[PDB]
């Protein structure tokens, strides 16, 4: 049931229904946060079990802040400029979650960084969307 | 004895739980030592009494070996035991409190899968030939002097080579 | 059956406690030992359901690797030990250098 | 048959080890209770790490153990219509057994 | 059922004392003295009053020790030693298991394992040494136990218990195997932990070995499984080694043909106990490993050999 | 995904033996001496059918046979088969090591009154070739149809047209 | 020879429990060359019956296997009865 | 230390491999990783100084962890289809558990900790036995499986050892580490093409082999732990200098030799496959692995580092280490272009 | 890869007893040998790909035979529609499952 | 004399396995009047028990060949008394 909630994000075109959209990329942004900080604790140990939590809290609310940032920004520059099938609408928001990455870790350097990285990722994911052939694909030949 | 195996590999959780749960290891052989004897009367259940009994007899002198290793070498100034700390018994709680909920949840909550608590006793062994006298698992066991000779020869020459493995490694 | 769902639920739980490591590395090898017992008792049930005589030495094959192996980790053990003094994992840490 | 007499047995043994503990008084203390090394005080602790010696040799038992495991399905396998091929190949493999322990008493591992 | 395992497990306590009774008596009487013959109508009964006094004597539990398995090690090997007795053939077995004999194996193999439970959970040194040493009469025993159990079974051809008193009737098996018999009983010397081979309760080495912290009813537990084993033990080889005549309509001749051969065989299993110097564990493991291991493997290839050699295979 | 067929309750009734295991091990040559051509009948009717309601007929008249013979038995020598089963059933074991002195009083009845010889030492063992009025099916086994094998490519190996065809090696 | 002699002499002297292991080890090697009694164990498993042989169908080629089991023709047991 | 037991336990550790490859029963071919495991073992801790020791109780705690999660998954498709070869018709879980611990037991990132660990317990005479056979007998079962497995996670795992393998061998300037992640990188390579061509992860396998064996016997000659010991080549034997350029070139796979063909036919066989996003992540990320074989580059070859006094010690003595193989595998590697279309 | 040692030299070192239908020490049958016997001569010549495609009812078939699945679910069902009719009223006391029935033989 | 009893050990079991090999199809002929008996004891009391739920015919098997499936202890004996199906699934076993 997480597949068929997280593939509502496709089958309703971009421009409408921002609140399901925003909901699907945050709940991204928290599953990516949680295995990251995952990753994070089973490779730094915190001192602390309290510290523990807070680096697990830390990460999972930076991530899902950036996924957040990412699909509001995706959807407000769908309804001002009504292009559905537009990867710039992608870049725009792609921008605006590194912006939110470089404004979590407090550096307008990795914030440029992650403008031009994740707004170039989320314009060749719509772009993969738009095409489609699969990033994971059957072998068939 | 219809639940018999049933409440055998119940108690097989409980003991891997022990296991699981990891104390210091003099504790975990003991239970491993009630998980191998469950697994002793667990296989000595289904009709092959050669098998689960050697593998008793296996498990005893090697969890002997190393219950001495783990009495000699590996031991602290403050054994640990299940209860001795409080996350340890209280994961036991909570690793019963979730067995108790998994039999629940196969018992009464949705009943779907190919995991069934109603089919007690009846499921156990499938069809056993009533009229033969070779059913003893002995001679399946002993299938592989005659038959699967080629890994019979494989696990000679391992234990050959593993006497040679230790001592090459513990000059 | 619920049999087996439980051998793999013991087999899950082995798998949990052989993927960390709380006081020694002894009690993770009594962890392995473990969890090839429960292997044990699967592939037994397996033979005997299936009234197959022929895969019936597998067990054996399977009790010869895993008590080889097991020994190899109690010699491995022995030049730890009387290395570090105290078997401890938390010890085992000069391999990042 | 085998069960009510691991039952009955740990029954009795158990109303042994109560009428051993509830028939006497019960008084204890703790120069009464205190371990016993010839009466003094711990000079250390007993689970400490002890370094014994017969560690190859334990470890030759628990490879022998594995192949008299190996060995131990004997009685059905010379009820077998491959007798010669058992013969040969058990032959090879109770050699190699004792081999073993011919290169162990050779490089001294029994010691 | 429940009368027979009566008969079976209560006359077999009360010879298990009267064992030890004239264990002292026949061990008093290899030393020049009468023996305990004043408490009792020719002493008959002093052991029974050890059981008794065992009982009000006060049990310990230390500070150091875990209680649990403290208290769980004499109550396992009490049940352990009576309920090793079960799978004996007898005239005709209580249990008729098909395979028994690695249940007597096996057990056996958990006999050696309750001592080791007990000197670690005593939390002494001295049962410490006891255990170690009980790890290593493991060393020693097991092996060459399972390959005298082995070869000389191969001549039966089965791990039933019951097929070996059809073979015996009319000759005994220490005609066909007398190597074999000598180095089961100095092997079972070893399991059963008596003086030749006692290494792990002796007062010479240590203070009684794994019996440092264990009084009143848990050590009469210990003492129990102890001369239950011995009993059995003596039972086993007369069982397997020596062969009885079978009528099988008078089970009775067969009994007490059955009771002078295994009172001759208690009677010289107390005599080696009580005639011979205390091994040291260091040549224990050296003259079985490196004398009697070779020699029991050797023996294996001979009886690998016999059935091919003569005869055809034994039966099912 | 079928209904599966079985024979109704008056056809599997018959004449039901109720015999014990001294009588029948204690004649059990005495039985396969007797009954063999019926007995590996049916045993070849199971074998060759692999399937119990195809054999129902045969059960019945080996049936017959078996109580045909155990009424002879009956009415000819009673009285050394009583004394040979009350003797051998004694045993346990049930080995025909405790009965040999009363067997031999068994083999005099059936010499005297009925004129039969008891098989010898592996005689019992060897396979029988036994005349069947059955027919036997093309399908025994009951299996489905078979799948096509793959069509296979015939004719001579010619060389790799212009060159190893890897990009520009040629 | 005579080295090896009076070493082989002055092991079993000595230490004579390897070597009459190493004796007995060679008298199983060279016991089933000349043993006379070594083809038999297998056919006797061979001849006793742990399944059922299935009866062949009647064709009528040649009586290469019998039509009745108690009559002696056929592949018997009386060599092996007599042993 | 014996040459008897080094007899068997070359032959133990040849024949793991060779019984992983000939026996056709899965359960067989966890009894040759077994042996392969118990064979190389001693051969891990044959040096006795306590980081081998270590090496070798971390390797063993990880390669046992793979073989007892393998023989779960044996076991368990002898419970669902009965029996011992994987047939096409089992489920994805017994198939992904098989992988997972196949993945654990080779040295794919995120399993990648145990392998720079392991090869900095021993030297490289033993470490190409570690390092490169030990991927012959993992690799003997991925080709028997290989239509079964998940491809999204086949190419999830090769994604994350290119990274990883190209992340990890930067900052760590041992010459076995670099190695190990240089492994790790070239692991993800050849698991990549995995469910597609069996037989070209054998070839990209046999590139990796005859790349890495004479690295290894050119690191062994001289046992250049380091970056500044391999550095010291132009003083100690300025004879593989020249040949450890294109070595190097080689392994970083640059266009005209050898190494170019493994990532050449990848990008071949996965172009055909349609994957356009994931095969251009595969080849954007092997130049960081360019980045570290370019510095030891710059270390050993064009640049002459600062040596010691007592390389004119090494000057002085006579030179007898290096064999045949170290030349004729060199250059069967690295310059054998033309014959790429006789090697698919 | 697979590298057919044994493909190659002829004798099956553990090519003997790679299924469930293969010869047993003395022919004691495994349980549902007729269904992988059926499935093997099904599944010869024709490959893994078609196979699925082609013997996908002989592999359900002997699927079933092993694991008795919807055997097991039929059982279940029955058993639970007897529970409820027993307490319904519906169903009889049954006497050939009461424990007072005529035992054949 | 270990020979002696050996052979004539064997020539005993032949015996018995003779009397047991000419005793089988007895075995056998009870065998499949049993076993087809009490299935149809289990067919008898199924349209008694599911005539009232739907899509479910009586006598239905779910293996698609019409060869005769071997009957299991739990399809055989599933239907009987607890005590009878312990004493089925638990009898050679448990007699110990």
Redesign the interface.
Known sequence: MVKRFFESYHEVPDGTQCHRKTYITTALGGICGIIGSAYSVSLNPADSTLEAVARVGRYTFTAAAIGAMFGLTTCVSAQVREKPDDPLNYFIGGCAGGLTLGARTHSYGTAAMGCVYMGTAAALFKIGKLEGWELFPTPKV | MNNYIFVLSSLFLVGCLGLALKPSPIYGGLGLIVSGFVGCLMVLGFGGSFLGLMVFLIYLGGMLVVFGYTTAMATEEYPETWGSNWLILGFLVLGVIMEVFLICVLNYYDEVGVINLDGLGDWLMYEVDDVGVMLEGGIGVAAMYSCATWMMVVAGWSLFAGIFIIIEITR | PSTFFNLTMAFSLSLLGTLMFRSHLMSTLLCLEGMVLSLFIMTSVTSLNSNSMSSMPIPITILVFAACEAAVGLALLVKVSNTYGTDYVQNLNLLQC | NLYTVIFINILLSLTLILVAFWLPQMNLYSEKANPYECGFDPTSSARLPFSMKFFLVAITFLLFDLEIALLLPLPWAIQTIKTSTMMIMAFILVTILSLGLAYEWTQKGLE | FFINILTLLVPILIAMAFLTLVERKILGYMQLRKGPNIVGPYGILQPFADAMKLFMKEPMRPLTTSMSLFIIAPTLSLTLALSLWVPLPMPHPLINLNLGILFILATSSLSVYSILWSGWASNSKYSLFGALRAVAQTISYEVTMAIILLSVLLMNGSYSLQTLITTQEHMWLLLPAWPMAMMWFISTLAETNRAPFDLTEGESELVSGFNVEYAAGPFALFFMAEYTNIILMNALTTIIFLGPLYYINLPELYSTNFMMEALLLSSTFLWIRASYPRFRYDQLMHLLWKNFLPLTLALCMWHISLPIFTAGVPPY | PGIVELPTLEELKVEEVKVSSAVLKAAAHHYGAQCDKTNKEFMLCRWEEKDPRRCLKEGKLVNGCALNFFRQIKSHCAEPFTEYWTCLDYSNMQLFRHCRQQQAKFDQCVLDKLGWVRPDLGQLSKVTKVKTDRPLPENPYHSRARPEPNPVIEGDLKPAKHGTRFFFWT | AGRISAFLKNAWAKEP??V???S??G??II??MI?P??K???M????????????????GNMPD????????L?????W??N? | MNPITLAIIYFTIFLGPVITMSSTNLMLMWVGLEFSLLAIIPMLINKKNPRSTEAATKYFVTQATASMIILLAIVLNYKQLGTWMFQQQTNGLILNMTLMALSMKLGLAPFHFWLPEVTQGIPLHMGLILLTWQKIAPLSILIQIYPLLNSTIILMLAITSIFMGAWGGLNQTQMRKIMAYSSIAHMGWMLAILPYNPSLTLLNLMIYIILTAPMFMALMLNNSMTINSISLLWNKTPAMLTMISLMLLSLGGLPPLTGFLPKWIIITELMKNNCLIMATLMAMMALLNLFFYTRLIYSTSLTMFPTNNNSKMMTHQTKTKPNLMFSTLAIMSTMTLPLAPQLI | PFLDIQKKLGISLDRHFMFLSAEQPYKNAARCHAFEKEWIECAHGIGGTRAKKECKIEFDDFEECLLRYKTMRRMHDIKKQREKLMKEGKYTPPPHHSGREEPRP | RMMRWNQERRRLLIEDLEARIALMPLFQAEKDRRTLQILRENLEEEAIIMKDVPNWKVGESVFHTTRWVPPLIGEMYGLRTKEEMSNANFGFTWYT
Request: aromatic letters at 12%.
């Open positions: 429990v390897l009459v292991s190493f007995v080890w008298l199983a016991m089933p043993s009694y070594t038999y164990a297998s006797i498993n061979k001849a006793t019956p742990y399944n059922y042989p299935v009866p062949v169908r009647d064709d296997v019998p039509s009745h089991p108690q009559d002696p056929g592949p018997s047991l009386d092996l009865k042993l």
